[PDB]
Design a protein around this ligand. Structure first.
Ligand SMILES: Nc1n[nH]c2cc(-c3[nH]c(CNC(=O)/C=C/c4cc(Cl)ccc4-n4cnnn4)nc3Cl)ccc12
Length: 237
C-alpha cells in the first residue's frame, strides 16, 4: 500500500495473508474471508503455483513477523479460478480458495459480506484498500498490515486513463486524480472494503494498475458484485 498507515490488531478481521512455501515460505497475496471454508482472492496469484499443497492461509495476522513454525494456518483443499481468466489486465481476476476445515470466527477472524442483493446502485464513499504490499514500485513486503482510504472513480473516467485496456463493467477503479495512495506489489488478492450503513462489503479485489499511486492512473479491482452468482454457484456446489 502506497501512502497508507499501519493497522491495529483486529481492525480488518477478514484480511488474510496467503503464503507459498515453494521454494521458500513467503507472502504471495492477500485474500478475504467470505465464509467459514472460503477465501476470495485474485486468479493471478496462482501463476507458477504448482498445486494447492504448497499454500498456507494465515488469518488473524497483523505483522508478518508473528508467523513462526508453530503458527496455525489453514490448508487449501481447492483453488477455483474463473474459467475465463487469462491475465489480470484482461479481467476475470477472481479465485476462490476452499479451506481444508472451517474457520471458527473470532474477533481476529471474521467474514466480510458480499455486496448485497438490492444494492447494485449504491454509491460507496467509504472504501479502503489493505495489505502487506510495497509502499512504492521497488520495495519489499511490509511487516505491519497497511490501510488507505481511496475514492472510487467511474468506469468512464477509468477507461479514459487506460485507453490500451478494455475497462469493463466487471472492473471497478479507485484512485486520487493527483495519485499518492494506492495498492502496489503484494497487495493483489486483498479486499477493497466499503462501509455502507455501518456494514462492510467486499466491493473489489485488488488486481492491477500502471505503476503504483501515479497521477490519473487509478488502481483496477475485480468488481465483486458482478461475480456474486459465480461465487454462490461455486460455494453451493
Ligand atoms: N514475497 C514477495 N516479495 N515481493 C513480492 C511481490 C509480489 C507481487 N505481487 C504482484 C501482483 N500485483 C499486485 O500485487 C498489485 C498490483 C497493483 C494493484 C493496483 Cl490496484 C494498483 C497498482 C498495482 N501495481 C503494482 N505494481 N504495479 N502496479 N506483483 C508482484 Cl512483483 C508478491 C509477493 C512478493
Amino acid at each position: 500500500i502506497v501512502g497508507g498507515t499501519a493497522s491495529v490488531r483486529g481492525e480488518w478481521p477478514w484480511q488474510v495473508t496467503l503464503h507459498t512455501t515453494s521454494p521458500t515460505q513467503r507472502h504471495l497475496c492477500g485474500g478475504s474471508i467470505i465464509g467459514n471454508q472460503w477465501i476470495l482472492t485474485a486468479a493471478h496469484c496462482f501463476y507458477g503455483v504448482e498445486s494447492p499443497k504448497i499454500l498456507r492461509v494465515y488469518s488473524g495476522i497483523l505483522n508478518q513477523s508473528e508467523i513462526k513454525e508453530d503458527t496455525s494456518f489453514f490448508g487449501v483443499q481447492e483453488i477455483i479460478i474463473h474459467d475465463q481468466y487469462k491475465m489480470a489486465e484482461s479481467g476475470y481476476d477472481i479465485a476462490l480458495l476452499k479451506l481444508e476445515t472451517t474457520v471458527n470466527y473470532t474477533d481476529s477472524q471474521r467474514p466480510i459480506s458480499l455486496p448485497s442483493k438490492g444494492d447494485r446502485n449504491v454509491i460507496y464513499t467509504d472504501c479502503w484498500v489493505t495489505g502487506w504490499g510495497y509502499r512504492k514500485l521497488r520495495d519489499k513486503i511490509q511487516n505491519t498490515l497497511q490501510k488507505a482510504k481511496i475514492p472510487l472513480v467511474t468506469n468512464e473516467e477509468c477507461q479514459k486513463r487506460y485507453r490500451g485496456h478494455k475497462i469493463t463493467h466487471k472492473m471497478i477503479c479507485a484512485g486520487y486524480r493527483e495519485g499518492g495512495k494506492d495498492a502496489c506489489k503484494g497487495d493483489s488478492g486483498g479486499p477493497l472494503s466499503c462501509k455502507h450503513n455501518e456494514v462492510w462489503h467486499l466491493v473489489g479485489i485488488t488486481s492491477w494498475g500502471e505503476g503504483c499511486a501515479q497521477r490519473e492512473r487509478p488502481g483496477v479491482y475485480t468488481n465483486v458484485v458482478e461475480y456474486v452468482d459465480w461465487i454462490l454457484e461455486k460455494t453451493q456446489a
